[PDB]
Amino acid sequence: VLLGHLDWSPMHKDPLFWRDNITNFEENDFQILRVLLTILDTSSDPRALAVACFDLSQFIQYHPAGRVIVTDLKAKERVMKLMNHENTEVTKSALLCIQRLFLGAKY
Amino acid sequence: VVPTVTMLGVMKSRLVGATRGHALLKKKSDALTVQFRQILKNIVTTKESMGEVMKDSSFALIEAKYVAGENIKHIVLENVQNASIKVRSRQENIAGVKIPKFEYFTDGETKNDLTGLARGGQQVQQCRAAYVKAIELLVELASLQTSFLTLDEAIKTTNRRVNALENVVKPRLENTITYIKGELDELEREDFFRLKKIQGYKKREIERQLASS
Amino acid sequence: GGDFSDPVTSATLSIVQVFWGLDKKLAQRKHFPSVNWLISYSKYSTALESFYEQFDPDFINIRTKAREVLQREDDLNEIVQLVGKDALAEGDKITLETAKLLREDYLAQNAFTPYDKFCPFYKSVWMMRNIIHFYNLANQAVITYTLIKHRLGDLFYRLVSQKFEDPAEGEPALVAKFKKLHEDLTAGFRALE
Amino acid sequence: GGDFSDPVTSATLSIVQVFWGLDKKLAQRKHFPSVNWLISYSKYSTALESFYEQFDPDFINIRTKAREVLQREDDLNEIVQLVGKDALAEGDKITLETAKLLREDYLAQNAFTPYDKFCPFYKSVWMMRNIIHFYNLANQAVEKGAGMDGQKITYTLIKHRLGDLFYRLVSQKFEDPAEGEPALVAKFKKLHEDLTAGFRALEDETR
Amino acid sequence: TQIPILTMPNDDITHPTPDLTGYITEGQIYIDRQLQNRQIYPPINVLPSLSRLMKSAIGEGMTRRDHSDVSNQLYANYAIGKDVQAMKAVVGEEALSSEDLLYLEFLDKFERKFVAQGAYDSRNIFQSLDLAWTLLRIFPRELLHRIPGKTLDQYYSR
């Protein structure tokens, strides 16, 4: 967020970090996550959107309520644009984001 | 003002300094506005404490009433064990604004307690627990008021500099430029042109006089 | 120094009908066209309106709407500057978003890119239609601005893609793609309302 | 271009004694006399001291009082142009008051009306005495009002409790001199007495 | 190649000779009086100074690949440091964030270690760029926004 650059790193593809980061976000309904969802919706770098989608996916799987919120959030709209978008890696991450929201909507 | 090259330089320097000062004041006002927005958000967030702690205090008061009926009140006012209310003040500085800091009994120093009522422990844990929230709310309100006043003063100064001072100076610079170049430079050429005409007339007269001989 | 007060500049502005006004500020902000929309003007539009309407009678109305949007862009600019985007209404937010999309997608060109090296007037007209018509169709629905933003989020990416279309496919193919995106955007705008 | 640095104007002002400079800003505001009271000057005020003395001993002093009021009004306007209308001393507010009255009711003249086409001298003398009397009464109230709040801050209260006399002060210029010299002098004297009695009573009531 | 040294009277560019030569040429390397007062021996005001065609000198075949990137980063960081110093003159410097202090120290180092070359300390462009990278590497690799990719990975590791 502060740097505004989304790069993959060893703890952003790891589930454990996200589990400890869920609580830190909550300040007005995952306010840090909502700003990150806004960052996923609009980002300075096209490459950042792909790692952003990876990051979101992990929090939603961990937080079922977050997954339903992610579908409502513009991050799902960015994922829909990414689904209708070139670059294989962006499309993979986008598909994984859609599925994460989806698992939770219907039980 | 009297127009001169030195005067033009002084006016240009004053305009440059005014622009720099206006930029600095705008930066300071923006920082103060950011701090004021943060303080307002904090006050809005802590407003819910005045409801939550109030509900807890009400529940404790109902429990104490159910326990011992009517409180003693009067001489000691009962209803509490803590909160020997005495307030201390401190002055913090943010962006040059002397934001006050507040501490008091059950929310800082100058606190004392003795015995209490039946549910006096519960009353302190609920009614006297709201003291910290109240102190935080008061500190936030004082900081917001001070920041609002400082931001108003800074914004007034910045707006005055942008509207009055710079727009006063720039016409002065234009008038000084026009007075020098539009008049003195034009006159200098005209004077020299008339002098050259006089020289040409003298040469022509000399040539004609020589030819007539 | 950029001061349009020298006698050469004053006489040129007094004689020349159309002044395009390249701005160094846009160049600093990495703008390929570098044309400042706030200062440029075309005094010959009144005479050119005959051909403008002959080509497309709605094109002149689209141009007027775009000029109004550009005029409101600075208004929304100081609105965000003084209080922020929070005070903007749903219609105001839609207008600001459409102005930003117009500035960053159509009002700006890419020059170096093969797809945007040359912009045919056909592609320009279809892009202007697909922008202005979508702007209106979103405007009269005022719907929560955030709710509209989430629903149109894919469309915002699609509008950048519509600009990305190459002229190699020919004017009709690019026009049909712009029309198809516009029709899909319009269908989303009316059905979801 | 209106600049007073022109060779004609400079040479003229180097020798002319009295000088009625004019300002374009007042002409823009439809002031009509357009005489800028801050830059104009009259070197002949010294010689006419005998005429003033044999006419009225009050005028030679109320003239200085009015000039001081005008200078103070200019300084206050310069200050408020950046500081703001607030934080002004109530004495300064009373100075800006009756300075507005002097501007819009004494120096201003329509010059195309049955009343402002001609103005006798002693009528202007009574106008100046009334304005200076208002100023002096207001500052006397400011000096002592049974408390600082009751002394100077009461200008807003004065604006209502004394509004009729203020309106009569500003409207005393509307009467044409053709209506008879004793009539106008009597009206001016009656206005002065009424204002004096009213404001003295108000300053002596509740304070 | 000409580097004509011109004296601008009254320390202003409005003078006829500098204003006239501005059009003919394609650059301006100003000597600043305040830097001379600050006892920096080359007082070249780098931020005001510019070359209208400095892009030709920067390249791959000639000079080094990272020339334009480091030049732009130095420019932007200097500007930011000057702005931060101006702010610290009025905000008390207590409220400055970490990045503000980073830019302040970078400005101090750039003024007292980079610009202040000795009268005889000849510096090849390669070691000059090495010094530039030494100053740059203080900021986090992600902070140097103006630097393109594949260059930070090459040089930020020192």
UniProtKB/Swiss-Prot annotation, chain D:
V-ATPase is a heteromultimeric enzyme composed of a peripheral catalytic V1 complex (main components: subunits A, B, C, D, E, and F) attached to an integral membrane V0 proton pore complex (main component: the proteolipid protein). Catalytic subunit of the peripheral V1 complex of vacuolar ATPase. V-ATPase vacuolar ATPase is responsible for acidifying a variety of intracellular compartments in eukaryotic cells. Belongs to the ATPase alpha/beta chains family. This is V-type proton ATPase catalytic subunit A. The chain holds residues 417 to 623 of 623 of the full protein.
